[PDB]
Design a protein around this ligand. Sequence first.
Ligand code: HEC
Length: 104
Amino acid sequence: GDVEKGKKIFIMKCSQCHTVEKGGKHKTGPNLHGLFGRKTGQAPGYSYTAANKNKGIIWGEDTLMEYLENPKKYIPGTKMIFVGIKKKEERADLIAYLKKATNE
Ligand code: HEC
């Protein structure tokens, strides 16, 4: 659950658009502050993707490990430009970091 690594990653992996900082902006990507344990297409006043609502799942440790793996797949029509991840520990750490960031 490397938090230091996930930091460098997110920094230039997701953070690029996302924002693990309460009060984030609806930039290229939505905020990621408490995304764990909440429904999708919730961010009010956002231009979410037609696939962001379509899915309509409960984000978490699984939905992620699965989603992250393939964002395009999971969300067909998502703007989230991301190839995906493979390394388990990579997703386990990256996710961990968040658990310390969003869930600091
Ligand atoms: C900007 C180019 C992005 C990058 C890089 C990443 N994400 Fe993203 N994400 C982006 C958008 C515009 C959206 C909405 C469209 C959709 O339905 O996906 C998302 C959505 C997600 C979601 C779902 C809702 C939410 O969490 O806010 C998750 C769980 C998510 N994205 C996670 C995530 C992670 C961990 C990334 C790097 C590993 C990542 N995103 C990259 C835009 C962008």
